[PDB]
């Protein structure tokens, strides 16, 4: 088992940031997925890991990450047999600065309405990363994502 995390980022307007993994990524390259995900460092909290990776991959600052699916665990296998088994708590947060893309990690991105992303995930789950789908289909997690679509002034 390995430790990891996943995060869903929204802007002040309530739009969700979806990203596409770079072609050079070892696992799931070129796949559309939720905002960010990674792995915490030896003595680092999950919250700080989210903050660190948001800065590293998206060059963005965020509000305090909220835990929306702490017990999420998953074992998925990428297109060339690479297998991943991890404890992956899920978080949601709002961006507080403009994005500055790191193309070694992200090859494309889109600010969208959550309602549309959920419709896409429900209709064609194969077009997205498996963890994005599994996380978005959890009733409790989905309710928290919905809460982040509120306009924040």
Swiss-Prot record:
Its cofactor is Mg(2+); Mn(2+). Mg(2+) binds at residues 37, 57. It is an enzyme of class 5 (isomerase). The keyword GTP-binding does not apply. Substrate binds at residues 21, 25, 39, 53, 57. Signal peptide: none annotated. It catalyses: isopentenyl diphosphate = dimethylallyl diphosphate. GO terms for molecular function: isopentenyl-diphosphate delta-isomerase activity; magnesium ion binding; zinc ion binding. Mn(2+) binds at residues 2, 39, 84, 86. Binds 1 Mg(2+) ion per subunit. The magnesium ion binds only when substrate is bound. Its EC number is 5.3.3.2. The active site is at 37, 86. Keywords: Cytoplasm, Isomerase, Isoprene biosynthesis, Magnesium, Manganese, Metal-binding. The record marks 74 as: Essential for catalytic activity. Belongs to the IPP isomerase type 1 family. Catalyzes the 1,3-allylic rearrangement of the homoallylic substrate isopentenyl (IPP) to its highly electrophilic allylic isomer, dimethylallyl diphosphate (DMAPP). This is Isopentenyl-diphosphate Delta-isomerase. The lineage of its organism: Bacteria, Pseudomonadati, Pseudomonadota, Gammaproteobacteria, Enterobacterales.
């Amino acid at each position: 088992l390995h430790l990891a995390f996943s995060s869903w980022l929204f802007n002040a307007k309530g739009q969700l940031l979806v990203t596409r993994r770079a072609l050079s990524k070892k696992a799931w390259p070129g796949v559309w997925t939720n905002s960010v995900c990674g792995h915490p460092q030896l003595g680092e909290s999950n919250e700080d890991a989210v903050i660190r990776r948001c800065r590293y991959e998206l060059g963005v600052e965020i509000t305090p990450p909220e835990s929306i699916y702490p017990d999420f665990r998953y074992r998925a296998t990428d297109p060339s047999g690479i297998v991943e088994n991890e404890v992956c708590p899920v978080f949601a947060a709002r961006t507080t600065s403009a994005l500055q893309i790191n193309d070694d990690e992200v090859m494309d991105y889109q600010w969208c309405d959550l309602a549309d992303v959920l419709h896409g995930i429900d209709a064609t789950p194969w077009a997205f990363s498996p963890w994005m789908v599994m996380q978005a289909t959890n009733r409790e997690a989905r309710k928290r994502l919905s809460a982040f679509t509120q306009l924040k002034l």
